[PDB]
Amino acid sequence: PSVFLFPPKPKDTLMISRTPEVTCVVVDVSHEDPEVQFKWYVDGVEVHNAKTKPREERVVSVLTVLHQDWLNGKEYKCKVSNKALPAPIEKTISKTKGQPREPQVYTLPPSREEMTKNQVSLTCLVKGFYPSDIAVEWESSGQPENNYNTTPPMLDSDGSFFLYSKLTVDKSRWQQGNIFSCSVMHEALHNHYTQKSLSLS
Amino acid sequence: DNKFNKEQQNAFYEILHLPNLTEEQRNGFIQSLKDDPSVSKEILAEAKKLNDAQAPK
Numbered sequence: 092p093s094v095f096l097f098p099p100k101p102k103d104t105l106m107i108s109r110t111p112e113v114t115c116v117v118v119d120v121s122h123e124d125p126e127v128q129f130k131w132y133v134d135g136v137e138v139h140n141a142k143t144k145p146r147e148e149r150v151v152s153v154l155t156v157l158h159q160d161w162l163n164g165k166e167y168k169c170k171v172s173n174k175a176l177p178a179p180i181e182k183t184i185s186k187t188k189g190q191p192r193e194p195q196v197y198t199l200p201p202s203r204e205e206m207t208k209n210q211v212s213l214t215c216l217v218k219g220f221y222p223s224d225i226a227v228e229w230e231s232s233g234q235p236e237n238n239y240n241t242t243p244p245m246l247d248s249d250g251s252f253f254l255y256s257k258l259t260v261d262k263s264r265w266q267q268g269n270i271f272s273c274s275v276m277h278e279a280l281h282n283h284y285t286q287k288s289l290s291l292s
Numbered sequence: 293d294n295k296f297n298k299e300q301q302n303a304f305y306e307i308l309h310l311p312n313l314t315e316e317q318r319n320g321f322i323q324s325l326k327d328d329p330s331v332s333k334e335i336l337a338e339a340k341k342l343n344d345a346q347a348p349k
Contacts, residue, residue, distance in 0.1 A: 188293070189327030222328075246334040248342065250324035 093118045094171055096182045102226035104161045105276050105283040113167045113184065115152040121175035125150075130170035130179075133160070141169075161186055162278055187222035191279040192251050194220035198273060198289035201265065211262050213289055215273040218253035220244075226276040229258045231269060236260070265291060293329065300329040303336040310339060312346040 095118075099111035115129055129152040131141045141154040152169060168183040194217050201211035217227065223244035229236040238259050244252040256273060265271075274286040307313070307321050321339045325332050 187328055187330075189324070246331050246338065248338050250320060250328075250335065250338075 092120060092173065092176050092180070094180045094182055096167075096169065096184045098184055098186070098224075099156065099161060100226070101224040102276055104156075104158050104224070105226065105278060107158060110155060111158060111161060112153050112155045113169075115154070115169040115171070115182075117150050117171065120150060121173070124173070124175040126173070128172040130172065132166075132168040132170065134165050135168075164188065186224070189221060192219055192221040193279040194218065194225065194275055194277050194285075196273070196275050196285060196287045198287045200289060200291070206262065209262060210259050211265050213258040213260060213265070213271055213273075215256040215258070215275075215287065215289075216253070217256070217275055218247060219249075219251045220253075220277050220279060221251045222278075223252045224278070225252075225254070227254070227256045228274045228276075229256070229271065230274065231271050236271065293326065297329050297332065299336075300325055300332040303332040303339075306336060307339045310343040312343045312348070313339070317342060 095116045097114040097116065099113060103109040103111035117127060120127060125146070127150050129141055129143065131138050131154050138154070141152050144151045144153065154167065154169070156167065164186050166183055166185050168181060171180045197216040199214040199216060201213065205211050213229075215227070217225070225244060227241045229239050236258055239256055241256040242254045244254050247253045258271065258273070260271070268291050270288055270290045272286050272288045274284060276284045304322060304325055307318060307325070310318070313321075321335055324335050328335070
């Protein structure tokens with residue numbers, strides 16, 4: 092009877108249009124008595140807006156949260172009851188504490204060496220941000236560019252975090268002056284988002 | 293914060309006694325341990341890196 096608890100996606104908590112949710116997952120449940128009861132708690136006060144997904148052959152419970160409550164460091168906790176198990180198992184999750192810090196966003200063009208290739212790499216360096224919760228996307232002239240990969244945040248020297256995001260694009264698109272932009276979303280950013288463009292001189 | 297993390301405690305002890313760090317650098321790393329205990333191991337490595345880089349010239 093394993094009990095795991097996950098935070099909402101960084102983007103969901105930052106964008107008012109999206110819906111952030113905390114997730115209580117469980118495995119190794121008793122096929123003998125495989126019902127299970129979740130009891131949620133926000134800052135030590137019980138809530139009842141949680142929904143349990145249909146079981147799987149895994150029982151997961153999803154609590155929707157207010158954007159501001161998560162960002163203001165409220166504690167979330169699901170109590171897991173089950174007759175086939177001693178006493179209930181409590182687990183708590185929260186946003187990482189500590190002075191928030193603004194990300195610095197730098198776009199780097201492809202190396203001259205990579206121009207020999209058919210596809211080139213557009214790089215975005217994001218550094219100096221805290222906590223590590225962050226989201227990154229790319230677009231070109233309004234439309235989303237999806238052929239990218241973003242490294243997980245990594246601890247830097249000063250306790251803040253950094254990451255790299257690599258957008259891969261055909262060399263042709265890059266060499267005829269197409270405009271590419273990387274959008275970053277973080278709590279310490281104005282309006283929780285900013286964007287930086289990258290294009291050939 | 294509240295509960296005993298072995299790596300956090302060990303990291304705290306070492307950083308407290310690193311001979312080449314300034315007071316402000318020492319406080320910064322220890323503050324990071326308090327705020328972000330889950331990365332105590334990486335914080336200690338960064339501290340040791342800075343400590344060795346500032347070894348008596």
